[PDB]
Design a protein around this ligand. Structure first.
Ligand SMILES: Nc1nc2c(ncn2[C@H]2CC[C@@H](COP(=O)(O)OP(=O)(O)OP(=O)(O)O)O2)c(=O)[nH]1
Ligand SMILES: [Ca+2]
Ligand SMILES: [Mg+2]
Ligand SMILES: [Mg+2]
Ligand SMILES: [Mg+2]
Length: 341
DNA sequence: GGGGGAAGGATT
DNA sequence: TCGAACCTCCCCC
């Protein structure tokens, strides 16, 4: 199987560049402003000029300003990036009917039936990169290998504006040499649990007792890591369908007062319903983020589709339930809809 | 013993 | 310090 993975470079910042070319060369920082104090919020993403100095996704806007006070700070315009993303995914469908759109800026293509070897795959990669640069003026990084996981790892190694092939021999080498923390799906918490069991490379999972591994990271992740270490990772490129849509907002101040939280909850429902564009959900979950950033949630599944009015009344009942069963103050409140018809 | 669904956790 | 979207206790057969 030959997999071709496409990851758009610094997507949100790059789209703003394409819409305002004078931004080119300048550190551009796309932010999510919450509405809680002057410059409260986080950096969603930044281009390379900004990342060179430490400004990256996740840090508070206030800290980014201390590092680069003269960078260009722009508010997130997700809807614009989503439209530009949908046009690039439509361009990728031309290269394969087996395509997996993993997020707004990532897609895997199974190109086994389009190329014979990695030399032909590498050329197809240049061709896709040229086609996207030509049509939308967006640079992307291409990763190629024998499965989705190594294709992504290749793209992580080659970004930005790159193209890399990790052949069978390199896959075998990485299984021995790659820090296991760089394997997709292994975040800080799992990486630390694995540094504790001694595991630091994929090959180390083959020699540890399975129940010891399973007991620490769970059955699916143990099986996943082992399958990769055995060079037996088999996951087909599958068409992905949006399974849930929702919106969670931060309130001006933390609260437990139902009538005070209500307008935020209702706005989240309004925004969520606009986004559902023709999908009718059968399940709704009210999601609260407590003052100490924990996530509490209550939901309900109906045997029928949920009308906006049923979403309004059921959400209050679910919010009341959250207030009843949890004593902490709520900071963020929202809703999530799923189980579409 | 193990489906299957609700809620919490981890990841990106 | 923001925020959108697969895996890990209990009812029930
Ligand atoms: N709002 C928000 N978005 C994030 C954060 N981290 C990443 N993102 C955005 C950037 C695009 C998208 C995909 O994220 P990935 O972590 O795969 O990173 P990436 O591909 O390097 O992102 P980019 O294209 O911006 O570099 O999610 C974050 O902390 N907050
Ligand atoms: Ca990207
Ligand atoms: Mg990405
Ligand atoms: Mg990037
Ligand atoms: Mg990691």
């Amino acid at each position: 199987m030959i997999v071709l993975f496409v990851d758009f470079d610094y997507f949100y910042a790059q789209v703003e560049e394409v819409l305002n070319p004078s931004l080119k060369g300048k550190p551009v920082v796309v932010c999510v402003f919450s509405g809680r104090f002057e410059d409260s919020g986080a950096v969603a993403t930044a281009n390379y000029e900004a990342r060179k100095f430490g400004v990256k996704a996740g840090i508070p806007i206030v800290e980014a300003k201390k590092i680069l006070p003269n960078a260009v700070y722009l508010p997130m315009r997700k809807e614009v990036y989503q439209q530009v993303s949908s046009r690039i995914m439509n361009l990728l469908r031309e290269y394969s009917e087996k395509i997996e759109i993993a997020s707004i800026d990532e897609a895997y293509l199974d190109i086994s039936d389009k190329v014979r070897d990695y030399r032909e795959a590498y050329n197809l990669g240049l061709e896709i990169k040229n086609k996207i640069l030509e049509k939308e003026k967006i640079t992307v990084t291409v990763g190629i290998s024998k499965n989705k996981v190594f294709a992504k790892i290749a793209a992580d190694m080659a970004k930005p504006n790159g193209i890399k092939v990790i052949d069978d021999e390199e896959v075998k080498r990485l299984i021995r040499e790659l820090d296991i923390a760089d394997v997709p799906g292994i975040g800080n918490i799992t990486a630390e649990k694995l540094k504790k069991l001694g595991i630091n490379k994929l090959v180390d999972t083959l020699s540890i007792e399975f129940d010891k591994l399973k007991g620490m990271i769970g059955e699916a992740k143990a099986k996943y890591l082992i399958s990769l270490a055995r060079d037996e990772y088999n996951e087909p490129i599958r068409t992905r369908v949006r399974k849930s849509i929702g919106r969670i907002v931060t309130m001006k101040r933390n609260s437990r007062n139902l009538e005070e939280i209500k307008p935020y909850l209702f706005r989240a429902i309004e925004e969520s319903y606009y986004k559902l564009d023709k999908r009718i959900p059968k399940a709704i979950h009210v999601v609260a983020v407590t003052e100490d950033l924990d996530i509490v949630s209550r939901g309900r599944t109906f045997p029928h589709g949920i009308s906006k009015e049923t979403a309004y009344s059921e959400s209050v009942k679910l919010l009341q339930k959250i207030l009843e069963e949890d004593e902490r103050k709520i900071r963020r409140i929202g809703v999530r809809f799923s189980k579409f018809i």
